[PDB]
Design a protein around this nucleic acid. Structure first.
Lengths: 36, 138, 433, 7
RNA sequence: UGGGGCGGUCGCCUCCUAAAAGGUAACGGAGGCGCCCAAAGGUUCCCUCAGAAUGGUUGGAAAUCAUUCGCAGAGUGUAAA
RNA sequence: UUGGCACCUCGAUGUCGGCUCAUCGCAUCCUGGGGCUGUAGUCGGUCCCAAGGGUUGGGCUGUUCGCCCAUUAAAGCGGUA
RNA sequence: GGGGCCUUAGCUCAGCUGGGAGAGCGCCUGCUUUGCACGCAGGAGGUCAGCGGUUCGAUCCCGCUAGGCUCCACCA
């Protein structure tokens, strides 16, 4: 999901900054968030 | 939903919002509160939305002190008419809020419950907000 | 009740009491009751013309019908057209329940034009219609009827009168000692109903009284009774009384030999209709409660008995779902055995062979564990049903005991006992305050 | 109006 | 006259807008006046208002009367300062 | 789009709908490549990257629009007085 | 675009400015009626169009829905 409010949904979510873009990766694929 | 049931005049000037808060700057009823950082008119609909958003998440706890009151009315001319020909009818009520003013006051709950309730209130308000607490020098 | 014979006696009494006279005041205090203030010879009279759906009557009342409210438009047209005039004669249209009032009323412009006021007492088809007695068009009616609703005999202002339908009978009075029997044709025993639908204007009460005066009903032990009762009706030999057996009342102009219990002898029909009845109200209350309450209690008892039988059906479905849980637990390890029914699947060793006996439906299915899990859920619902349906059976027998008691207490007793039963019920339960 | 009907 | 029309207004007085002299606009926001009083005018001599409580018989929250607390919460013909 | 103002034109800036010819931007209708799906497969839903190409014949009404008939991979929104 | 009142029993629709949803018509049950489809009582319907706030109870108070019927929109 692409939203400008990338936030950790659960405790397993990890905030990363690939390619100058704030992203959240997680073991659950529904929690994958990107902005920009 | 808050409005005065009687006013001296139904149409008033819009005023100016220069300077800091004249009063209501320090938290002195509850333990935690919201301090305003920017100045804009706060509609009583927004006040009601923030109050329900705090009260729902604080289903068990103390009461909410609403430090602001929408005493100033604003007039709204009807749509699709020419300019002038008299001032329009009053539509709603707003509260003139200056930076530094305390908006809502909470006591009788935990720290994180109060912080999350104030965050949920602040996401309904049109101004930048911050978390403040009582200081005891004193 | 009510009938052409009682109508004939009423016309005779009104001809005896109010002949000529002057109608000083016309009042309509209720929706169906019309009061005529007749100033006849001697003192004043109060004639009542009632067109109630169940309590319609014509008699000279004596009590004060209070609350004179703002009069409706039929009463105003009656005061415009009838007041100030005289009554010529009161006669009956044959033997049917039709009352004809001949009003010699002066018109409002000064001249005289006779008016005919028609009073029909047919229960729920009762009406009061005034005509101008020359063209016989309806000036006004007490109940206004449309060309669609009650298409025959339309009652509108200005429309021509149509006159009530013919019942296709013979005149019962001064008929013949032979005509009366050459047409009833008794074959299998519908005697009272044959008298009702073969004679003009006769109530079933007079038929049931006549079949008791005949004694043993035969070919000749019946027409002499009818001629004897018609001779009692004629020559004006009426004996008005009130008779009842239990609570609900009856009235007639002749003494009743059948259906005994009370006598309450009267003098004239005016005091008879004044005493019975006013009009309903207590009699209409015990009419609206009596059979409806016991019907409701008996129907609810039948509901509760059917409920107990269908709860015992669920009590057998309990053991059926216990067998289903056994068969699901049989399936659960399964398919140890083949899918089909997974019957008798057990491990020979290192198994706790429950090996319960089971009835084997074919074993489902696409989702092999959720079928056994569905069986196990049905079992949990079954045991919760074992609790709740036993509670409902207990409540249903309590309700049947209370309703059988209510049937007993309605099937007669006291009056004062019924009063305090009402009191106790309303106490039982608080109940907004 | 503004009808182009020049003659 | 935020085109003209339709609506509304046209003279005088009071407040705000008016930015701590005066003045200052808009089809800006609020109201009144086209009078009244032979006295409510002039002079002289006296006095101080409205509301709360207590007590009172017809007085109950209030008709009329005594007391305190009363720098004006009254009145000043008519309306704002 | 409907509006607001009246800056340009009243010694003229022709105004709707159609026909002909087009061009441009994606906030993409299809086709192409993907993520998440409460995506079993077909068909789907939502959100990305993508303008290369194509995006219909009628009945009604001056009509744009709209409704209906029959198709289609789809019968996309707008700007260019 | 601007304003009004409702949206409640299969139907017509009350309910007074918050004190606990009802009348008429429809459908059944029982009584009664000699007879002409003329009478009586007793039952069910409603989340009061819908949604969450207030207070001890909300058709009533409030916003936004969703409708109906209101009563008009001077132009090129």
């Amino acid at each position: 999901k692409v939203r400008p409010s990338v936030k950790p949904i659960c405790e397993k979510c990890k905030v990363i900054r690939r390619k100058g873009k704030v992203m959240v990766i997680c073991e659950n694929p529904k929690h994958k968030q990107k902005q920009g | 939903m808050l409005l005065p049931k009687r006013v001296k005049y139904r149409r008033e000037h819009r005023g100016k919002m220069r300077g800091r808060a004249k009063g209501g700057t320090e938290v002195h009823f509850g333990e935690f509160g919201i301090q305003a950082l920017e100045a804009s008119w706060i509609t009583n609909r927004q006040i009601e939305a923030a109050r329900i958003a705090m009260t729902r998440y604080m289903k068990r706890g103390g009461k909410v002190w609403i430090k602001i009151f929408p005493s100033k009315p604003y007039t709204a001319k009807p749509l699709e008419v020419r300019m002038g020909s008299g001032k329009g009818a009053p539509e709603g009520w707003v509260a003139v809020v200056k930076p530094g003013k305390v908006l809502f006051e909470i006591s009788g709950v935990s720290e994180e419950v109060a912080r999350e309730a104030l965050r949920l209130a602040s996401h309904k308000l049109p101004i930048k907000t911050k978390f403040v607490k009582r200081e005891e020098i004193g | 009740s009510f009938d052409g014979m009682f109508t004939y006696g009423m016309t005779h009494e009104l001809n005896e009491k109010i002949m000529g006279g002057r109608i000083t005041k016309i009042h309509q205090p209720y929706k169906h009751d019309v009061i005529f203030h007749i100033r006849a010879k001697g003192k004043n009279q109060k004639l009542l013309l009632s067109a109630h759906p169940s309590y319609s009557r014509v008699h000279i009342t004596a009590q004060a019908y209070e609350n004179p409210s703002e009069p409706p438009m039929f009463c105003m047209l009656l005061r415009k057209h009838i007041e100030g005039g005289f009554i010529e004669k009161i006669e009956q249209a044959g033997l049917d329940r039709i009352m004809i009032f001949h009003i010699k009323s002066r018109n409002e412009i000064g001249d005289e034009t006779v008016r005919k006021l028609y009073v029909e007492i047919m229960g729920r088809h009762s009406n009061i219609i005034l005509t101008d007695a020359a063209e016989n068009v309806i000036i006004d009616g007490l109940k206004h009827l449309s060309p669609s609703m009650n298409s025959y005999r339309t009652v509108l202002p200005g429309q021509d009168y149509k006159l009530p339908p013919a019942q296709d009978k013979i005149s019962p009075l001064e008929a013949s000692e032979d005509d009366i029997l050459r047409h009833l044709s008794f074959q299998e025993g519908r005697l009272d109903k044959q008298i009702v639908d073969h004679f003009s204007g006769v109530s079933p009460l007079f038929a049931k009284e006549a079949v008791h005066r005949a004694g043993l009903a035969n070919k000749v032990t019946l027409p002499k009774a009818l001629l004897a009762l018609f001779a009692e009706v004629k020559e004006h030999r009426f004996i008005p009384n009130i008779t009842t057996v239990n609570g609900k009342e009856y009235f007639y102009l002749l003494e009743l030999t059948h259906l005994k219990g009370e006598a309450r002898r009267f003098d004239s029909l005016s005091e008879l209709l004044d005493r019975f009845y006013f009009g309903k109200a207590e009699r209409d209350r015990v009419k609206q409660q009596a059979q409806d309450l016991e019907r409701f209690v008996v129907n609810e008892r039948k509901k509760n008995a059917n409920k107990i039988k269908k709860l015992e059906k669920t009590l057998e479905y309990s053991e059926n779902a216990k067998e289903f849980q056994l068969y699901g637990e049989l399936l659960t390890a399964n398919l140890y055995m083949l899918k089909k029914g997974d019957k008798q699947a057990e491990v020979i060793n290192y198994y706790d062979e429950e090996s319960p006996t089971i009835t084997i439906p074919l074993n489902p299915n696409k989702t092999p564990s959720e079928n056994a899990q569905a069986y196990f859920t049905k079992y949990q619902k079954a045991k919760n049903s074992v609790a709740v349906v036993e509670e409902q059976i207990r409540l249903a027998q309590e309700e049947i005991e209370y309703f059988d008691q209510l049937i007993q207490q309605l099937s007669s007793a006291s009056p004062r006992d019924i009063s305090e039963i009402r009191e106790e019920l309303v106490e039982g339960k608080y109940l907004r305050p | 109006a503004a009808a182009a009907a020049a003659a």
